[PDB]
Amino acid sequence: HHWGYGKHNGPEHWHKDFPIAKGERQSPVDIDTHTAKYDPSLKPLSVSYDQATSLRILNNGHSFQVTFDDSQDKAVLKGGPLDGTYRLLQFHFHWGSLDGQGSEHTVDKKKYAAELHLVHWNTKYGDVGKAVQQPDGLAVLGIFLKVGSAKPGLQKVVDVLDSIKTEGKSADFTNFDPRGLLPESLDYWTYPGSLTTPPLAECVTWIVLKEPISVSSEQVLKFRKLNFNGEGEPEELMVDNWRPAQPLKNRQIKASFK
Ligand SMILES: [Zn+2]
Ligand SMILES: [Zn+2]
Question: Per the annotation, where are the binding residues for Zn(2+)?
Answer without folding.
Answer: 92, 94, 117
